[PDB]
Scaffold this active site. Structure first.
Site, short mmCIF file in Angstrom:
data_model
loop_
_atom_site.label_atom_id
_atom_site.label_comp_id
_atom_site.label_asym_id
_atom_site.label_seq_id
_atom_site.Cartn_x
_atom_site.Cartn_y
_atom_site.Cartn_z
N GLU A 58 1.06 -0.90 0.22
CA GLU A 58 0.18 0.24 -0.18
C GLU A 58 0.67 0.92 -0.09
O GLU A 58 1.33 0.72 0.71
CB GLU A 58 -1.08 0.05 1.66
CG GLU A 58 -1.75 1.38 1.21
CD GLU A 58 -2.02 1.35 2.56
OE1 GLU A 58 -3.25 1.99 3.43
OE2 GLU A 58 -2.15 0.50 3.91
N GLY A 96 4.61 2.36 10.50
CA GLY A 96 4.13 2.29 11.70
C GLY A 96 3.72 0.46 11.62
O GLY A 96 4.41 -0.57 12.00
N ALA A 97 3.10 0.39 10.82
CA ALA A 97 2.26 -1.30 10.42
C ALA A 97 1.08 -1.58 9.47
O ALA A 97 0.76 -0.47 8.92
CB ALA A 97 1.44 -1.81 12.16
N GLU A 115 -4.54 -1.69 13.06
CA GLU A 115 -4.16 -2.31 12.23
C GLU A 115 -5.00 -3.84 12.18
O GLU A 115 -5.66 -4.82 11.46
CB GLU A 115 -3.17 -3.47 12.35
CG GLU A 115 -2.07 -2.59 11.96
CD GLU A 115 -1.99 -0.80 10.94
OE1 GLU A 115 -2.78 -0.91 9.84
OE2 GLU A 115 -1.73 -0.37 11.53
N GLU A 147 -8.52 4.62 7.15
CA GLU A 147 -8.46 5.56 7.81
C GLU A 147 -8.66 6.07 8.65
O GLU A 147 -8.74 6.52 9.98
CB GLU A 147 -6.91 5.71 7.25
CG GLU A 147 -5.68 5.54 6.39
CD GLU A 147 -5.19 4.47 7.16
OE1 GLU A 147 -6.13 3.95 8.15
OE2 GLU A 147 -5.39 3.29 6.71
C1 LIG Z 1 -1.42 3.91 14.62
C2 LIG Z 1 -1.40 3.80 12.69
C3 LIG Z 1 -2.07 5.18 11.97
C4 LIG Z 1 -0.02 3.80 12.73
C5 LIG Z 1 0.35 3.73 10.84
N1 LIG Z 1 -0.27 3.02 10.10
C6 LIG Z 1 -1.38 3.12 9.40
O1 LIG Z 1 -2.45 3.68 9.79
C7 LIG Z 1 -1.52 1.60 8.35
O2 LIG Z 1 -3.13 0.94 8.92
C8 LIG Z 1 -1.62 2.05 7.17
N2 LIG Z 1 -2.40 0.85 6.60
C9 LIG Z 1 0.12 1.50 6.66
C10 LIG Z 1 0.64 2.98 5.38
C11 LIG Z 1 1.10 3.75 6.06
C12 LIG Z 1 1.82 4.97 4.94
C13 LIG Z 1 1.46 4.61 3.51
C14 LIG Z 1 0.60 3.06 3.56
C15 LIG Z 1 0.18 2.05 4.33
C16 LIG Z 1 1.60 4.09 10.72
O3 LIG Z 1 2.25 4.99 11.27
O4 LIG Z 1 2.09 2.88 10.20
ZN LIG Z 2 -4.45 2.42 9.32
#
Ligand SMILES: CC(C)C[C@H](NC(=O)[C@@H](O)[C@H](N)Cc1ccccc1)C(=O)O
Ligand SMILES: [Zn+2]
Length: 867
Positions: free
Chosen positions: A118, A258-259, A295, A317
């Site tokens: 992603e 982050g994840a 997640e 999100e």
């Molecule tokens: C606790 C979360 C808000 C932390 C956040 N992760 C997410 O939002 C994941 O669900 C995102 N779907 C991962 C992501 C982040 C940036 C670009 C592409 C994909 C992150 O910072 O990785």
């Molecule tokens: Zn997310």
């Protein structure tokens, strides 16, 4: 550079791929990918199949096993012509994980191989319909060296496995749920594995598996516990159960974010998984809880129902952030969570909405989608979901969630679909509310009041306006849920009513200007406005200091008490920054210091709340109180304010510090609150009489039986430049240099130090044994922290900060565009600074603009910043 894409140009795909069978012949240097897709044409019969592909070595193309001659490769694509209505596409191509420094697609993390798809990383793996409205059923076969990669994982369940000659083996996975390719995941490596089980409320036993690097099992239990807590909460609060047989999470050291919520196989930055009491702080524990939950919550809000296109990112999100906030709030302190999220909104998101990068939570224009995983899409997105919750109430909100899933389960949806579900289920009209999705910028709500003793009526005249932003020259009024509460002189709530009928405390501020009249107001009230930050707006009301201190002692909701303190401090932060610019020392009324003394001595106040009230706004939060930011004045005033409060409250601070001592260390909310309060006091005590402060701080660092207290002491030594600072910092280095996650805390402290030679120190640390430009966490903890969290130093008058960042970005632009883009943000805020600084920042941006092979990630931001 690539052209911008627009939301209004959305068009259904000419072809759909219903099933894809992948085979990976894995190797770090050369991986061979064989993809067999079952395609179905939906568009015009003469339309070609356009597949996205980036950095791929095409080996062959077959249609129903027939070598295809009607195709052409073009920039970022493989165009296949003259196709049947239904057919089997077979693509074989090569990629090189070891050469993938951008960490997008299939790459190497240490000795392991893993993926990040992603927003559009799958196209870096094979030619495909890399768009989220194309959902396919995946089957993945992985072939690799058994010794180097004993574990071969992908989404779903293992349906086949075997051994091969030359020490190789394979495993095949099947995921029954159709999914967009951004949710595809593959992991190969040698790991220690923590296995557990969770039984859903209906009886489904789910196997839980947490994969970590060898030797990290001692830091995995909390994450596992948090996963189970997340699963239980989603059942209790949203009535949602996990839908597969196994839940895998892999913690990797090299990750740009982050994840990631890959279906049944989440991939996490180790920072949000690994914890033990001597390496992690209370904050780390709560962050791990938040991210693990986040997640997991995507399983429904993002996976079972995904996004039609990337402009709809907030659909998953914003909603999932809302869900992770409710999770954290339900399990811990709702007040502290709300306070922290409002600090992020006011201090960071508002800044973005006032920058060249401003955009609505549902963007209209995007060049590089990776630039849109923003505070706006996430945090403001969540505030918009929360406003719907405020307008509907929990019951109807859940009815809306239920209708949303009933209608869209198994499909890709839009933000509008979500709002429609909420409107239809609740019968609450959200037509005007929808503007929150299309309009950027922060609304400014101005309130004027009047109390009429003759009629015993209280009148609120409320106005709203959103200043133009660089992306939108036209702004219109929004539907603003404006929560209020009125208090009599005894602190008792005054019933809201009019014409003999009760009035809802959540006012509907929908016009440019409107009045709200309340009768049966027997005595002049003290109002609490925009309760719980009911709308993401800036409030303009002429508070008297007394109204604010009154609220600090009588407001019913803990958030209101904290908020009142923030308004009280704002007045004096502004006063003293102006004084600083004229060479004048801090000035603070006695009654202001008394308000905080009262908070310290109030035995009835929740330690959790007291701790936050005693935590001064950050330099970034303070910056938003000004039109033109003076970072040096802000930094010095913050310290001066800390010193003054430390002097005026010396005895009370020490008393509370000692009263909250805890011999046992527990990751339990009541204990965390007391510890947060104790350390909030420590921040001030660090600025007491030098010797006294030095002894107290060094003592806590050495006697600490957990990282929270140790880091709090170390941070104080650095903040107050205490005599013991160098010794403590070296001791930390000697003890933890081998642990990157732990050293990140140290790098952040070095980068945000008030010392005069901070830049020299930061530059030198680029050669530190624990630092490496190949790791995003290290980069963000040292360079990112300097540029974004030490604006006083980053904005040094000589421009040295900008030159340093340009040097780092020149490297990162080629190495890892995504991390480079996160790091350039501080320079994009140039118009918020004085002319001299703007000139230097523009020069820095112009230098980056002329870089050979400038990434689209940076191009998009540089262009807007220089406009
Ligand atoms: C606790 C979360 C808000 C932390 C956040 N992760 C997410 O939002 C994941 O669900 C995102 N779907 C991962 C992501 C982040 C940036 C670009 C592409 C994909 C992150 O910072 O990785
Ligand atoms: Zn997310």
């Amino acid at each position: 550079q690539p052209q911008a894409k627009y939301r209004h140009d959305y068009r259904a795909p000419d072809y759909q791929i219903t099933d894809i069978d992948l085979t990976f012949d894995l190797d770090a240097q050369k991986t061979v990918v064989t993809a067999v897709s079952q395609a179905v044409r939906h568009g015009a019969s003469d339309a070609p199949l356009r597949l996205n592909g980036e950095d791929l070595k095409l080996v062959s193309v077959h249609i129903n096993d027939e070598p295809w001659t009607a195709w052409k490769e073009e920039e970022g694509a493989l165009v296949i012509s003259n196709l049947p209505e239904r057919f089997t596409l077979k693509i074989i191509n090569e990629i090189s994980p070891a050469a993938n420094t951008a960490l997008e697609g299939l790459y190497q993390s240490g000795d392991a191989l893993c993926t990040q798809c992603e927003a559009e990383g799958f196209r870096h793996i094979t030619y495909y319909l890399d768009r989220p409205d194309v959902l396919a059923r995946f089957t993945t076969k992985i072939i690799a060296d058994k010794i180097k990669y004993p574990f071969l994982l992908s989404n779903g369940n293992r349906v086949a496995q075997g051994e091969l000659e030359n020490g190789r083996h394979w495993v095949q996975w099947q995921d029954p749920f159709p999914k967009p390719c951004y949710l595809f995941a593959l992991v190969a490596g040698d790991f220690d594995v923590l296995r557990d089980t969770f039984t859903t409320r209906s009886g489904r036993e789910v196997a839980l598996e947490l994969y970590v690097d060898r030797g990290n099992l001692d830091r995995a239990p909390w994450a596992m516990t948090s996963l189970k807590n997340s699963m239980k909460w989603d059942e209790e609060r949203f009535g949602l159960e996990y839908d597969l047989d196994i839940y895998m999470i892999v913690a990797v050291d090299f990750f740009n974010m982050g994840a990631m919520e890959n279906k049944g196989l989440n991939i996490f930055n180790s920072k949000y998984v690994l914890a033990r009491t001597d390496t992690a702080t209370d904050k780390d524990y709560l962050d791990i809880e938040r991210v693990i939950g986040h997640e997991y919550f995507h399983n429904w809000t993002g996976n079972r129902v995904t996004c039609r296109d990337w402009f709809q990112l907030s659909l998953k999100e914003g909603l999932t952030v809302f869900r992770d906030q409710e999770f954290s709030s339900d399990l811990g302190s709702r007040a502290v969570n709300r306070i922290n999220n409002v600090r992020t909104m006011r201090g960071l998101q508002f800044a973005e909405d006032a920058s060249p990068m401003a955009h609505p939570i549902r963007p209209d224009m995007v060049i590089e989608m990776n630039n849109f995983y923003t505070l706006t899409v996430y945090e403001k997105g969540a505030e918009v979901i929360r406003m719907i919750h405020t307008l509907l109430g929990e019951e109807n909100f859940q009815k809306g969630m239920q209708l949303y899933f009933e209608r869209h389960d198994g499909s890709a949806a839009t933000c509008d679909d979500f709002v429609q579900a909420m409107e239809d289920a609740s019968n609450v009209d959200l037509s005007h509310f929808r503007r929150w999705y299309s309009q950027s910028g922060t609304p400014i709500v101005t309130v004027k009041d009047d109390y009429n003793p003759e009629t015993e009526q209280y009148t609120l005249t409320i106005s709203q306006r959103t200043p133009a932003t660089p992306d939108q020259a036209e702004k219109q009024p929004l539907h603003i849920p404006f929560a209020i509460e009125l208090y009599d002189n005894e602190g008792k709530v005054i019933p809201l009513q009019k014409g003999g009928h009760p009035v809802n405390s959540v006012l509907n501020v929908t016009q440019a200007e409107q009045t709200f009249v309340f009768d049966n107001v027997y005595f002049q009230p003290v109002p609490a406005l925009l309760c719980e930050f009911s709308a993401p707006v800036k409030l303009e009301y002429k508070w008297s200091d007394q109204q604010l201190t009154f609220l600090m002692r009588h407001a019913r909701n803990d958030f209101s008490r904290w908020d009142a303190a923030q308004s009280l401090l704002a007045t004096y932060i502004k006063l003293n920054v102006a004084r600083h610019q004229q060479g004048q020392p801090l000035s603070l009324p006695v009654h202001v210091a008394d308000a905080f003394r009262a908070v310290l001595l109030d035995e009835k106040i929740d330690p959790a709340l007291a701790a936050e009230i005693l935590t001064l706004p950050s330099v970034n939060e303070m910056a938003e109180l000004f039109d033109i930011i003076d970072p040096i004045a802000i930094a010095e005033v913050r310290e001066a304010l800390t010193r003054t409060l430390a002097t005026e409250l010396a005895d009370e601070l020490l008393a509370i510090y000692n009263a909250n001592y805890q011999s046992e260390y527990r990751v339990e909310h009541e204990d965390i609150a007391k510890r947060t309060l104790r350390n909030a006091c420590l921040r001030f005590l660090a600025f007491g009489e030098t010797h006294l402060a030095d002894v107290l701080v060094s003592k806590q660092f050495h006697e600490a039986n957990n990282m929270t207290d140790a880091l709090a002491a170390l941070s104080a030594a650095v903040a107050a430049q205490l005599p013991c600072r160098d010794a403590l910092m070296q001791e930390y280095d000697d003890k933890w240099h081998q642990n990157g996650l732990v050293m990140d805390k140290w790098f952040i402290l070095q980068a945000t130090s008030p010392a005069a030679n901070v830049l020299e120190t930061v530059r030198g640390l680029l050669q530190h044994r624990s630092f490496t430009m190949s790791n995003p966490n290290r980069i963000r903890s040292l360079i990112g922290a300097f540029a974004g969290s030490n604006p006083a130093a980053f904005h040094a008058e000589d421009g040295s900060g900008y030159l340093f960042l340009v040097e780092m970005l020149t490297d990162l632009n080629s190495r890892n565009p995504q991390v480079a883009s996160r790091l350039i943000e501080p320079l994009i805020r140039l118009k918020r600074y004085d002319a001299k600084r703007q000139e230097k920042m523009r020069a820095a941006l112009e230098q980056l603009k002329g870089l050979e092979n400038l990434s689209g990630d940076l191009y998009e931001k540089i262009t807007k910043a220089l406009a």
